[PDB]
Design a protein around this ligand. Structure first.
Ligand SMILES: Nc1ncnc2c1ncn2[C@@H]1O[C@H](COP(=O)(O)OC(=O)[C@@H](N)Cc2c[nH]c3ccccc23)[C@@H](O)[C@H]1O
Ligand SMILES: COc1ccc(N)cc1
Lengths: 333, 325
């Protein structure tokens, strides 16, 4: 059997080009090479307060977006996290093998606590343990994610190793698959801050479902630097905005930064931004064209969810059975 | 019938205080209330434990509750981990529980997240079954209050999804104090086991512990009820009264001109009389694996039917896409 790939994305906000480059791009390319399982993590989404209609709609939007990107339900298992109870079950169990200090030290918890001070909830704190349960359920070998998830992934490995050391070979110890370029796409008006699907300032973000024209305007307005003459060179410290543009272009086209630097020799930021806008306006038009075909077909979306949850539960129940046996629960018969 | 929820720890080493106090009280109210008994194995693992002993303890607890008179045809008794809805609701309620509320629970960075987060699981345990009443001790009053606050908070956002649970106020009335410390209650959590009489102790063990029990230096020795001045003797009277149903004034008359030796002898004989009938039932149930499996299956099946209905409403309110069956 093939090694197993697992990853997920929250149905909250509107997925950005950041989410595509750091994760979904890789998800599509891994489908034949590995046994791939992709999840819409609605249980993680509710750690941030959403309107009920928006949550339901965003779950289906996200599903249709996976499909529009090229995630093929004939190759990959595609499911909604809440449809498989084993995530919640293993998540509770793994709380007992996770230290408080490991969760309080998390960057994401700290960033999210500052952003949502009126709702610093227990789910936001316990976030990484459920995420570990998501991965560990499927005997996952590889986890394609953006750089912002490295810390969460490190904890999952620690939990797997710690549990295995007491009980035997129950889990696989997963490995991150973070891409060389586009692992952490930055904000267009604030290139020192990660591009967030929940920025109020829309201008920071390139939406996967935002109007391309509005997106082309966003690239042209992206902040660069005061260098005289302007030079297209990679330097995240002194040229954050230009570097982010080079990183985006590299990730979309598959060309290296040193290659792109040679390509823009004697050129300035107008050329860079023309070429970035071109490459991105292109992906989105195509992507949004596949999207509606999927998104307006409720019977097909219902079928993908049904089939995917079936496949997922078969794997997850198998692992949870072994976990429950090992910790000492009386088996349900 | 109001719905009553109790969580039973699979590790508790139950005493005659537990039995003649709350347990016997509740055995005689299984037709008055819709009683739920949940053996809380997911709570147990917040303390690291030997796996095989936890499995054994789950079944020991089930058999002991059955032996004490919990009737699986009247009440619902089941193992927590057999009903996935507990963990499911637990996670959802984490998202409507403040971090501060958990930090302020009467608790540095080396405690496991389960020990930190279990009050939310407790809330889920109760709220799943539309629980009206929860019989708690003083030590779990804070947890009940949190579950009431979570229920009201969720209902204010989404409509009346949960019942707001109430404490069960009336106490059993059977008083049972520690043998070497008559001022303190006999507790299943006592490190000093000479203070307690476990429900599975044999007649020789009970004799030894009752013989050792503290009594005053009154001269002449007198068997009279007086908690302030004769705590130990009064405890022995209360235990004997609880066992036989004879009133304190009846026992005071029964022991007129008798020393503390004769009282201790009668207390030991009385308690062991009670424990022998209970132990016969326990071992009969406990050694019948097929009967225990059937009780767990039926109970989980009953619990799940109810729990799934609540969780479906919870899931609909939050806005999750409904599962495709
Ligand atoms: N500006 C950016 N540049 C590049 N990559 C980015 C950018 N912003 C986000 N990402 C990546 O996109 C994925 C989805 O984002 P989420 O916020 O839903 O990502 C999250 O919140 C996860 N915890 C969801 C999750 C839950 N359980 C899991 C198990 C395995 C893997 C992932 C998960 C992520 O991989 C994230 O790293
Ligand atoms: C009681 O809170 C929890 C927390 C996490 C999970 N997965 C289940 C229940």
């Amino acid at each position: 059997t093939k090694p197993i790939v697992f990853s997920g994305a929250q149905p909250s906000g509107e997925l950005t080009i950041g989410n595509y480059m750091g994760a979904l791009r890789q998800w599509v390319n891994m489908q034949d090479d590995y046994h791939c399982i992709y999840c819409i993590v609605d249980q993680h989404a509710i750690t941030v307060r959403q309107d009920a209609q928006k949550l339901r709609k965003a779950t289906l939007d996200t599903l249709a977006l996976y499909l529009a990107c090229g995630i093929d339900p004939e190759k990959s298992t595609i499911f909604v996290q809440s449809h498989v109870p084993e995530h919640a079950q293993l998540g509770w169990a793994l709380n007992c093998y996770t230290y408080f200090g490991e969760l309080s030290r998390m960057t994401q918890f700290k960033d999210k606590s500052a952003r949502y001070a009126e709702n610093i909830n227990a789910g936001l704190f316990d976030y990484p343990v459920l995420m570990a349960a998501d991965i560990l359920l499927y005997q996952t070998n590889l986890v394609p994610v953006g750089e912002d998830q490295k810390q969460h992934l490190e904890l999952s490995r620690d939990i797997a190793q710690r549990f295995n050391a007491l009980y035997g070979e129950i889990f696989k110890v997963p490995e991150p698959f973070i891409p060389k370029s586009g692992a952490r796409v930055m904000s267009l008006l604030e290139p020192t801050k990660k591009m967030s699907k929940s920025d109020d300032n829309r201008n920071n973000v390139i939406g996967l479902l935002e109007d391309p024209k509005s997106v082309v305007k966003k690239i042209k307005r992206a902040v660069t630097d005061s260098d005289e003459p302007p030079v297209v060179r990679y330097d995240v410290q002194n040229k954050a905005g230009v570097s982010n543009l080079l990183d985006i272009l590299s990730a979309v086209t598959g060309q290296s930064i040193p290659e792109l630097e040679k390509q823009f020799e004697g050129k300035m930021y107008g050329h860079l931004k023309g070429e970035v806008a071109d490459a991105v306006s292109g992906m989105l038009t195509e992507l949004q064209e596949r999207y509606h075909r999927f998104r307006n077909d409720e019977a097909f979306l219902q079928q993908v969810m049904k089939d995917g949850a079936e496949k997922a539960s078969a794997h997850a129940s198998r692992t949870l059975k072994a976990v429950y046996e090992a910790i000492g629960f009386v088996a349900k018969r």
